[PDB]
Design a protein around this ligand. Structure first.
Ligand SMILES: CC(=O)OP(=O)(O)OC[C@H]1O[C@@H](n2cnc3c(N)ncnc32)[C@H](O)[C@@H]1O
Ligand SMILES: Nc1ncnc2c1ncn2[C@@H]1O[C@H](COP(=O)(O)O)[C@@H](O)[C@H]1O
Ligand SMILES: Nc1ncnc2c1ncn2[C@@H]1O[C@H](COP(=O)(O)O)[C@@H](O)[C@H]1O
Lengths: 561, 285, 554
């Protein structure tokens, strides 16, 4: 059971098809009835065998600060967290919001939560007061933890709910420190199916709902991720991702710490400085690097003769498709293939170009054998023919390990979990060699700049403007950000379509919505295309945009920002 | 304010396009405007779409018209004159208004842009005596013409269309703003090594005051710094002058002379607008 | 006299010999000092007199997409283009590369350019990064315009040269839209001799040079074409041709819009599907159809009892000779003569079978009276004997109207224009009735599949392969494509002549060369001889049906 991870770590140093299958079989034989990944992996393998290896190298490209933690100091620091939480009366299952920048104390808190059997809710640093209040209505916090830069936003969204509050960096009235109790509190003996993480994610239908992950789904599912990513014990591994999402638990936390590697973490506020981040990658001799295609697209525009990357051996992408042309430019220069891989908050990595797998450009590779991946058609029958598009699904008997428990929303479970398959709501085709190719969403979910966005959430916020009678939010093709958020708005009687109105509404949306959600385009229309029932045809709003694109016209009341 | 306009039965209303732009965003079925017969604008261009919304609702044309502190009204949509939208109308016959080209010769062709000027013999009545500054008089009063430093074209019916400034002068929210004045106040902050203040397109206020700042070594480009500088500028500058954006840069694009190419600052802003991206250390307030 | 065009339009509805001669004389009396075909003809005649006639019927047989535009909507749409270009600071004479599929917005841009007095450089959609970089070295772009399908090729060939870029279908970062401006920009008052078009054409010696056309040479030369073609106002006229060449202007643009017809445009990617395209001709009720002999050769192999062609009245060919047997098959079936006619990028139509002229099969007809066409011998003395071959030449005093200004190459001007004639570098004979018969090039220029091809350009690209020590490219007889591009290759020591090598070299050439240029045959030889003698040798080998020892056919 410890021997599993020792076999796994070796698999990594030289992986192949056949030895993967062995790994697969061994996971199926794990006894995960009572499990706690911190105790059983972090402490019992890494802290015990490599306690004074560097677990984390951290760097803030704005401030300049660098800080280094060994597996030991990090285990201690995490126990002080867990002791401090416990001291403020936190039992197992209690809710902990975590809203901080990239920072060692983030990893610390992750650990303290997993060890203590608490429910953590990763919250991003660009979330608004409004977004946060929504979250609190849906799941009431027992404790919340922030940096000083975003304490006001939590303080305001809280209002006057009783909670224990904590700062990771600096002082603030009625906020507490995390490092003031003893670095000695015990594991919570968690069931492997016990909940430790909730992720608020957008759907195609409503306001964002919680994805429920357990003490095994992520902590052990991440194998699939780690295996595709190709992270080793030897590696210094960096993930270009943000704090409040699943790509972080994926490549910034679980995948590296599974294999006893050195994590590399970089914090920046505001805009990504592509030249400075790439400089810091080289300067820190990262060896495994996972960034999103958004980042990759920006990197390849640089003058790339500034860099050697003599120490970089693995480069990976996830979250949106990876342009063949990006892959090519980076290869021709640095002699590395950017290996695309696929998954969602609800899962771990499900499909991926593994280290040993010949990459076909514009393909996310082949399915990981620990998920039973099937293309189904609209009628729900299995597709067995090349170049036929269908829904990506996961077969549920037996139930794969990295798969979330379900949503906190029973309606959304009814739609995703059907006839013994979980539907990802992604569409794809496979080829003659079983390589998968992304087609797009069968949903109306939007992906700007590697952020998943819900229509109704933006439509909701739009109704908050007195002028708005109805709203329909769709994504429009954009090479930089995959999709742009556009809103079609029908106006109430009395208001007339102007640019100045469009702007006024957009500026309002800025106070309610995370920036990625704020429509880049606003179009006023007399009506929204409807079915007989009265249901909005977001489909046809998209089709209409396409026909307009093909004769290079912007709309008569379309206002671009 | 519009409730008070109606409530007091004003009959003639001048307001600036800034105001007008805000009014048309209301629900305008709240008002009758029983008593209102004339509506007018001055100081910036008046968007054709603004004119139209107000007309469709209350059945009144907002008549734009043109002039400077230096003058009285020089060009205008008179009450009896058919309005062509986005035109400030025709010259008042009591001013001798001429479009001149770059060489200073009078323009005799529709759709040709040039400088709005006032012919000085005889000297029109509403024209100021001059500036208290003799250097500024030498620039404005040349070869028999007072230059407004505005550019325009006329059409085949002699209607004038505003094009923009030949200057680097800014008009946020119908307030004329000098770059050097704000650049100066910015060098008052210890951190600021160089500054260039330009106007950036903004639908609400016509132009935003943005500052490009080169930093002294020691200070690092942060949101908190941008704010600290801005809050300082609030104690020195009239609100309309206080930059709404501050962008820190390594250098300012310059000519061989050392003169700031506010030209290329604008072109660069445009390419960035088309990708909805901020500059690396551009802070918007 | 704009009354010229109104007289011309009528001439078209029923032409004859005598009334032709009047048209001829009337062109000589035009005032072409200041001229702008869009303003003066498109807008002032067609938009005014038939603004709501269908100017364009468009279809993409792959996507399914279809469009219908009236002379009005098209004029508006073109003004939005011109407004947008001007807004990006485009003055008269500025260079505009245009690389798009067959699409409404293509016509739109054509109009905007002609109206705005820009120099347009038609670029075909199959041109490689290499070929496009060549073009930029030879003439720098002020602006470039593409579809989204070929944006990366332009982007890469540019590197980071400053230009304004524009997309006709869709968005892409740092590309601009064309319809965000006003539906009215003002005409540029062009002189008639002002340049509006540059065409990169292949020649025998070097890399491709620019052919220079004016605001009258094509916009008014096209008369000769339109008159031979026999296109009318009533007609729905389809020209099967691609976007970056003269024949598009010749028949997809000027000849139809001169006479106020409905243009029919069909876009396809990839290889021509002869039975679907022909079915779309019928299904759209085209009435006048221009197509190249390559197309026609493919059509006649169909089962032709699939089609009625109830609406089809005029059928025409240009670019290569038209086999008498093709003409005959199409006649016997649909009761129409495919009227061949002749010209070059350098000119408009110069010789042709007019509608009212008795066709002799495999003859391009007789000279259009607006060109003074003479067969000259080797001394440049005029040929006055049947079945005597000689150089096709154009007499320059007085200077015919549709003739280009010259090349961008002063050496090439010195070779072509001389002793008071422009030499086409084509050879022909006339017969006892004065009908002209094409013999071939006096050059080494090649025409595969209605594409003019330069040898040195392909020889150059060939030396880019490490294996290639020497290369000579000639054209070889082929019934389907008139000529094949064949390469003789001398190999470096170390390479042994194999099929797989020939292929490897060909695949390399595909990344460097437009498909039509990529040799269909590769023969490895010990040494090279006199592209002339390469051809003679091929001929003797044909007569004994023998392959070369290491000749590999694709
Ligand atoms: C990465 C993550 O955790 O994303 P998350 O925010 O949960 O959204 C999940 C959605 O991302 C998209 N997605 C992920 N990987 C992709 C890939 N390799 N190619 C194309 N699309 C990809 C799909 O559309 C998923 O359904
Ligand atoms: N109607 C108008 N349209 C455009 N610009 C205007 C208009 N009226 C005033 N301005 C600008 O504002 C300046 C007048 O400044 P001020 O002295 O503050 O009124 C003019 O010189 C113009 O450049
Ligand atoms: N009808 C035709 N018959 C034979 N050759 C032709 C014909 N039309 C064009 N050509 C050839 O094609 C050349 C012009 O090619 P292009 O410049 O692509 O139009 C001429 O110089 C001729 O050699």
């Amino acid at each position: 059971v410890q021997d599993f991870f020792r076999k796994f770590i070796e698999f990594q140093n030289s992986p192949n098809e056949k030895s993967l299958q062995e790994i697969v079989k061994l996971v199926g034989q794990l006894d995960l009835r009572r499990f706690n990944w911190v105790r059983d992996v972090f402490e019992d393998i890494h802290v015990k065998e490599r306690g004074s290896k560097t677990a984390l190298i951290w760097r803030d490209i704005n401030t300049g600060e660098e800080a280094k933690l060994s597996y030991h100091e990090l285990s201690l620091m995490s126990n002080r967290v867990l002791s401090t939480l416990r001291k403020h009366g936190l039992k197992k299952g209690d809710v902990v919001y975590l809203m901080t920048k990239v920072h060692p104390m983030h990893w610390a808190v992750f650990l303290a939560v997993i060890k203590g059997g608490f429910v953590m809710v990763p919250s991003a640093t660009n979330l608004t007061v409004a977004e946060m209040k929504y979250r609190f209505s849906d799941l009431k916090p027992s404790a919340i933890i922030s940096d000083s830069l975003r304490a006001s936003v939590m303080e305001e969204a809280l209002g006057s709910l009783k909670v224990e509050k904590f700062l990771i960096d600096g002082k603030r009235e009625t906020w507490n420190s995390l490092e003031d109790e003893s670095s000695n509190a015990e594991p919570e003996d968690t069931r492997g199916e016990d909940v430790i993480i909730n992720y608020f994610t957008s759907g195609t239908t409503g306001m964002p709902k919680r994805v429920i992950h357990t003490a095994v789904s992520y902590p052990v599912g991440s194998i699939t991720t780690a295996s595709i990513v190709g992270v080793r014990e030897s590696d210094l591994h960096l993930n270009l991702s943000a704090t409040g999402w699943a790509k972080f638990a994926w490549s910034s936390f679980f995948s590296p710490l599974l294999v006893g590697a050195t994590v590399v973490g970089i914090n920046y506020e505001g805009k990504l400085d592509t030249r400075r981040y790439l400089g810091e990658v080289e300067n820190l001799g990262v060896t495994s690097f996972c960034a999103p295609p958004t980042a990759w697209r920006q990197f390849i525009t640089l003058d790339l003769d500034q860099f050697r990357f003599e120490r970089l051996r693995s480069v990976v992408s996830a979250g949106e498709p990876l342009n063949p042309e990006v892959i090519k430019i980076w290869k021709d220069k640095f002699n590395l293939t950017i290996r695309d891989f696929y998954g969602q908050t609800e899962t771990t990595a499900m499909v991926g170009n593994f280290p040993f797998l010949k990459v076909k450009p514009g393909s996310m590779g082949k399915p990981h054998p620990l998920y039973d991946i099937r293309l189904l058609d609209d009628e729900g029958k299995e597709i067995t023919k090349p170049y036929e598009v269908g829904h990506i699904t996961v077969k549920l008997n037996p139930r794969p390990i990295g798969l979330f428990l379900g949503y906190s929303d029973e309606k959304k479970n009814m739609e995703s979990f059907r006839e013994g398959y979980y539907y990802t709501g992604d569409k794809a085709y496979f080829d003659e060699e079983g390589y998968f190719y992304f087609v797009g969403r069968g949903d109306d979910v939007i992906k700007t700049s590697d952020y998943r966005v819900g229509p109704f959430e933006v439509e909701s916020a739009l109704l908050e403007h007195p002028a708005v009678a109805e709203a329909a939010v769709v994504g429009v093709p954009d090479t930089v950000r995959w999709q742009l958020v556009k809103a079609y708005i029908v106006l109430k009687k009395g208001y007339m379509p102007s640019k100045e109105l469009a702007e006024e509404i957009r500026e309002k949306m800025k106070t309610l919505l995370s920036p990625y959600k704020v429509p880049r385009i606003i179009e006023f229309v007399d009506e929204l295309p409807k079915t007989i029932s009265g249901k909005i045809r977001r489909v046809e709003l998209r089709k209409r945009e396409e026909e307009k694109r093909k004769k290079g016209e912007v709309g008569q009341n379309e206002y671009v920002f």
